Amino acid sequence: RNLAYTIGLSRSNKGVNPIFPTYGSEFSISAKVTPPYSLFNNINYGDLQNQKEYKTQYTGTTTTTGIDGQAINPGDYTKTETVNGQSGTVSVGSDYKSADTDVGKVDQKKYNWLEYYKVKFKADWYTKIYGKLVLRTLTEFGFLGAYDQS
């Protein structure tokens, strides 16, 4: 979900034909900002990968066998191991610290509410050099960032 506010200031004095301008310039500055959710909500986005809720686990209710040939009881944490050529998940027991971090859950929590800021700057200038020949200079900038690097 994304909730943003955008404000832009532009100054254009080009003329006379929009298709082939012969004089003037156009300067535009924009800034799209989202609420800083990271500041108010007390959540550590850096330690998410080191928590039980963000570790791979077996949600089934029937005992199964992993790639290692061992039992995988319901509710036990899992880890990925490559036995021979094929690779698969191997039960780690209740030691969630040794399990694999669920990147999908971490990314979901990190990107559940989009938090960013976008700044765009553009400058266009038109001038007549000789006769009907006109020179156009264009400079564009774009910056996308986040309030919290974590």
> Which parts of this chain interact with other proteins (CB under 8 A)?
63-65, 68-73, 76, 91-95
Binding at 71: pick from other proteins, ligand PTY, none (beta carbon under 5-8 Å per type): other proteins
Stretch in the footprint of ligand PTY (CB under 6 A) among 6-14, 37-45, 90-98, 124-132: 6-14
Binding at 133: pick from other proteins, ligand PTY, none (beta carbon under 5-8 Å per type): none
C-alpha angle 8/147/104, rounded to 5°? 115
Would you count residue 31 as binding ligand PTY (CB under 6 A)?
yes
Q: Which residue is listed with tokens 């082939």?
A: 20
Would you count residue 7 as binding ligand PTY (CB under 6 A)?
yes
- Binders of ligand PTY among residues 78 to 117 (CB under 6 A) are none
Stretch in the footprint of ligand PTY (CB under 6 A) among 29-37, 66-74, 93-101, 107-115: 29-37
| Of 45 and 117, CB closest to ligand PTY | 117
Residue from 43, 67, 119, 134 in contact with ligand PTY (CB under 6 A): 119
Q: Which two tokens stand for residue 111?
A: 């990107």
Secondary structure string (H, E, C) spanning the chain? CCCCEEEEEEEECCEECCCCEEECEEEEEEEEECCCHHHHCCCCCCCHHHCHHHECECCCCCCEECCCCCEECCCCEEEEEECCCCEEEEEEECCHHHCCECHHHHHHHHCCCCCCEEEEEEEEEEEEEECCEEEEEEEEEEEEECCCCC
Residue from 2, 3, 6, 11 in contact with ligand PTY (CB under 6 A): 11
Residues of this chain that interact with ligand PTY (CB under 6 A) are 7, 9-11, 27, 29, 31, 33, 119
